[PDB]
């Protein structure tokens, strides 16, 4: 199947004293493998999956140097943005950046991304062709001009199509035992009576990897979305994911309702019934 490498960065300014709080995290697919937290004592990029501990001291030195450089760029950005938006020194503000690459089942490049937000809103983003920029407002337009003059898109394109995909392949291979393994959802159904006339059926999916999944209900073999509740996919905490979907039905009519589960780890979608 498809795979991705993604990095997420958040900087939050601290009015009154010192530098912003900066947190960087890296993922392969749904697996975190590295972190940096400016509040942490080590001041090093740290491993978060065993397969990355294969990399030597040089790797850790390099990733530490780059991530600290990312942090400094964000520090300067917070001040520049305060200026662009005519804001005071009083309030805390946030910058977020995400970048990375997607590859298909053949591990060949599919697409790349580099997006940036200020105070939770779009600021500037690399377009899909990796050649130009989407700037949301006039401040971001000024940034766009700066980044055009500096040929930032060209640099990012080379990293996204090259280094990104190359190291994603590396990580996939080194972490094959987990990264290339799919964990099919373990499914069950529960039942609850609301009143003498109404029941809830809840269809559960547990212990799955990767996170992508689809759970649906059918009534007499037809898709049923009314009177259903579908929760956000949530981490179990052990690297797997959980989700459920529920339906409200007339008491006694449970047999008409079927749950349908699609996941990469299931060679064919699974069906569950109450009985």
């Amino acid at each position: 199947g498809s795979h991705s490498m993604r990095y997420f960065f958040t900087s939050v300014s601290r009015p009154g004293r010192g530098e912003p709080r900066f947190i960087a995290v890296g993922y392969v697919d749904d697996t975190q493998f590295v972190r940096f937290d400016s509040d942490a004592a080590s001041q090093r990029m740290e491993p978060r999956a065993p397969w990355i501990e294969q990399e030597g001291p040089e790797y850790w030195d390099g990733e530490t140097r780059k991530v600290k450089a990312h942090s400094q760029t964000h520090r300067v950005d917070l001040g520049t943005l305060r200026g662009y938006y005519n804001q005071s020194e009083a309030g805390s503000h946030t910058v977020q950046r995400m970048y990375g690459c997607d590859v298909g089942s053949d591990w060949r490049f599919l697409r790349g991304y580099h997006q940036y937000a200020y105070d939770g809103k779009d600021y500037i983003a690399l377009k899909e062709d990796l050649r130009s920029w989407t700037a949301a407002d006039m401040a971001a337009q000024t940034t766009k001009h700066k980044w055009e003059a500096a040929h930032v898109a060209e640099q990012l394109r080379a990293y996204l199509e090259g280094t990104c995909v190359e190291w994603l392949r590396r990580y996939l291979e080194n972490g094959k035992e987990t990264l290339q393994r799919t964990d099919a959802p373990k499914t069950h159904m529960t039942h609850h009576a609301v009143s003498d006339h109404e029941a809830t059926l809840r269809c559960w999916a547990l212990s799955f990897y990767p996170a992508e999944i689809t759970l649906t209900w059918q009534r007499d073999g037809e898709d049923q979305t009314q009177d259903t509740e579908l929760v956000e996919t949530r981490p179990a905490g052990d690297g797997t994911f959980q989700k459920w979907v529920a339906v409200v039905v007339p008491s006694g009519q449970e047999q008409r309702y079927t749950c349908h589960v699609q996941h990469e780890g299931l060679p064919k979608p699974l069906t569950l019934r109450w009985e």
Binding site: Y7, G26, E63, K66, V67, A69, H70, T73, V76, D77, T80, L81, Y84, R97, Y99, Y116, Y123, I124, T143, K146, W147, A150, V152, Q155, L156, Y159, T163, C164, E166, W167
Partner: peptide
């Protein structure tokens, strides 16, 4: 593997 440089806004 992180990009080897970012650019200020």
């Amino acid at each position: 593997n992180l990009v080897p440089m970012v650019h200020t806004v």
